[PDB]
Design an enzyme around this catalytic site. Structure first.
Site, short mmCIF file in Angstrom:
data_model
loop_
_atom_site.label_atom_id
_atom_site.label_comp_id
_atom_site.label_asym_id
_atom_site.label_seq_id
_atom_site.Cartn_x
_atom_site.Cartn_y
_atom_site.Cartn_z
N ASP A 70 -28.75 -4.55 -5.21
CA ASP A 70 -29.81 -4.55 -6.23
C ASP A 70 -29.18 -4.53 -7.61
O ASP A 70 -29.66 -3.84 -8.50
CB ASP A 70 -30.72 -3.32 -6.04
CG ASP A 70 -32.05 -3.42 -6.82
OD1 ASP A 70 -32.60 -4.54 -6.96
OD2 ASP A 70 -32.53 -2.36 -7.30
N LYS B 83 -28.71 -5.48 -11.15
CA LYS B 83 -29.63 -6.03 -12.18
C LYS B 83 -29.30 -5.34 -13.51
O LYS B 83 -28.77 -4.24 -13.50
CB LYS B 83 -31.08 -5.67 -11.90
CG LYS B 83 -31.72 -6.20 -10.65
CD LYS B 83 -33.19 -5.78 -10.59
CE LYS B 83 -33.33 -4.25 -10.53
NZ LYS B 83 -34.72 -3.80 -10.23
N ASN C 168 -30.01 -1.66 -13.76
CA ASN C 168 -29.12 -0.76 -13.01
C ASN C 168 -27.70 -0.66 -13.54
O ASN C 168 -26.79 -0.17 -12.87
CB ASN C 168 -29.14 -1.17 -11.54
CG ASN C 168 -30.49 -0.98 -10.92
OD1 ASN C 168 -31.31 -0.24 -11.47
ND2 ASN C 168 -30.74 -1.62 -9.78
N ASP D 92 -28.38 3.42 -9.35
CA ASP D 92 -29.46 3.11 -8.40
C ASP D 92 -28.96 2.46 -7.11
O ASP D 92 -28.97 1.23 -6.97
CB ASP D 92 -30.56 2.25 -9.04
CG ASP D 92 -31.77 2.04 -8.09
OD1 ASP D 92 -31.71 2.52 -6.94
OD2 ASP D 92 -32.78 1.41 -8.49
N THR E 67 -18.27 -10.46 27.97
CA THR E 67 -18.43 -11.87 28.28
C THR E 67 -19.90 -12.27 28.03
O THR E 67 -20.81 -11.56 28.47
CB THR E 67 -18.05 -12.19 29.73
OG1 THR E 67 -18.07 -13.61 29.93
CG2 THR E 67 -19.04 -11.56 30.71
#
Ligand SMILES: C/C(=N\Nc1ncc[nH]1)c1ccc(NC(=O)c2cc3cccc([N+](=O)[O-])c3[nH]2)cc1
Ligand SMILES: C/C(=N\Nc1ncc[nH]1)c1ccc(NC(=O)c2cc3cccc([N+](=O)[O-])c3[nH]2)cc1
Lengths: 285, 285
Positions: free
Chosen positions: A122, A124, A127, A143, A162
């Site tokens: 997140d 941005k 933040n 954040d 397998t």
């Protein structure tokens, strides 16, 4: 009212900011009479706190205290410069030099996360916090509410056996597995684009193409006039981060080695801001 | 030695089976003097137990007791028929009628799981237990060690916001998200193939093509002579389960509606086996 155990240690003061599920308040630690920030998250916050208690990097926020009461209260150091968001809103843009300083720190932060098996998810401008109201300051990523710890995957466990009974789509996913961290490099690319130009690369403003189609084709909105003053090197990096194939996308290491960040003045300013922040205890020799 | 709290309630007896991390023992419950099975798992087993304590279906194993000691001990009802694996090993094959009875129950079990937000992820003949040594018996699905609880995804939370900073690969994954359960339908298809034919559809036996390529192309090994005695309807279902696109693949509902399972005799035998198993307490009217 504030919880008693919080009031016991801190005197609560004015509002500094107010996010969606929360709000940030100024507080004074009683013991020291020094300012702190207290983030309120209204009711995995507790595991966000444990992630953050483990990480130790100057460009990632540190938790000083935590109270789990009617709401969550997270005490941290004051970041008087506020959010980076406010420096880039309204088509405002930073000097190219200031973008480089901030971005270098973001890359160092995110590199540290990825080396430690943590993806933020997140990233941005909201933040990214700034240390002071001065242009040349330290930044911290905050954040971690959407963050994820990388570990041994379901896929890894399946591939030890397998695949007699294993579905084809699981085998196909092996091609692209273990590149979840690349989502953070893409976000950084978008943040860098915004910082350098003052506008978002992907946006529904005056276009016919859907946001989703803009993003998945990687066709960012390039306005020559805004970019003419920006260096070629800075835009070259942006372009290597906004690559749609996550495996071809630049990692934080590749970005840190990019020509745009081979800038000894910028790095000197970062180091100077660090020692200024620091208060050590005396060394032998 | 066995843990004291286990010895307190049960007298431990002979070995019935022995898996990789475990072993299954015969035991007698002291209170009732009746036989039980005790699965030993050597050191999320505890959360496997909580998943299983919630589920209530006649074709899914029930936990009678659990001890978390030096090892894990899981007490359950005896399944005297043993594993389905042993009925299909060495090119042995079941009557087509017996395959239908068993498979119908598997579909009911897995349908119940998927309706309840649980994917098994390890459906194999080893994980299908038979009630008795009679051909016409109830079966139960066991071993939920790889199971996953479906819930609100990271993706769902991301898509609530605007994707300004969101990586293209996340947007692309929306196309195919929420079909994790289809892995269980594929496994069922493979189990059905084995039950009907006595051999595995994908296998490295006398072939040049890699197991992985066999699976991802969906090109199962078809030997006409083995299949000539099997009905077209049974093979038609197999083919709708071994579809490589997970979104086109038959769901458990689609399989239950398939002509092969519209068989009132088979269904009558299932219902008769259920009431025989059951011991109710007397009803009004
Ligand atoms: C850890 C965290 N949020 N976590 C979660 N988890 C789910 C939702 N939020 C934070 C989110 C935002 C935070 N913001 C601040 O500390 C802050 C914002 C802000 C704005 C102006 C001025 C200051 N200041 O410290 O002087 C400011 N400090 C601090 C922590
Ligand atoms: C829940 C579970 N395993 N879980 C996990 N989790 C990680 C690895 N195993 C089981 C796995 C296998 C189980 N097998 C049996 O109960 C069983 C096997 C077997 C073989 C022959 C005869 C009997 N019998 O009950 O008469 C048998 N009973 C029972 C439970």
């Amino acid at each position: 009212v504030y919880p008693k155990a919080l009031r016991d240690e801190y005197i609560m003061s004015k509002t500094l900011g107010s996010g969606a599920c929360g709000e940030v308040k100024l507080a004074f630690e009683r013991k020291t009479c020094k300012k702190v920030a207290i983030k309120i998250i209204s009711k995995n916050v507790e595991t966000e706190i444990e992630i953050l208690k483990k990480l130790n990097h100057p460009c990632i926020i540190k938790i000083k205290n935590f109270f789990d009461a009617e709401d969550y209260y997270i005490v941290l150091e004051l970041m008087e410069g506020g959010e980076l968001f406010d420096k880039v809103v309204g088509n405002k843009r930073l000097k190219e030099a200031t973008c480089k300083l901030y971005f270098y720190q973001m890359l160092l932060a995110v590199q540290y996360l990825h080396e430690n098996g943590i993806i933020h998810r997140d990233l941005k401008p909201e933040n990214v916090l700034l240390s002071s109201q001065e242009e040349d300051c330290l930044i911290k990523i905050t954040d971690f509410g959407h963050s994820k710890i990388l570990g041994e995957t379901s896929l890894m466990r399946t591939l030890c056996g397998t695949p007699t009974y294993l579905a084809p789509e699981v085998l196909v996913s092996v091609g692209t597995a273990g590149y979840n961290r690349a989502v953070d490099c893409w976000s950084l690319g978008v943040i860098l684009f915004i910082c350098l130009s003052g506008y978002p690369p992907f946006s529904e403003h005056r276009t016919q193409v859907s946001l989703k189609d803009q993003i998945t084709s990687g066709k960012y909105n390039f306005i020559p006039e805004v970019w003419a003053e920006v260096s070629e090197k800075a835009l070259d990096l942006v372009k290597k981060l906004l690559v749609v194939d996550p495996k071809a996308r630049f990692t934080t290491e590749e970005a840190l080695r990019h020509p745009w960040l081979q800038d000894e003045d910028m790095k000197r300013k970062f180091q100077d801001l660090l020692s200024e922040e620091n208060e050590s205890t005396a060394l032998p020799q």
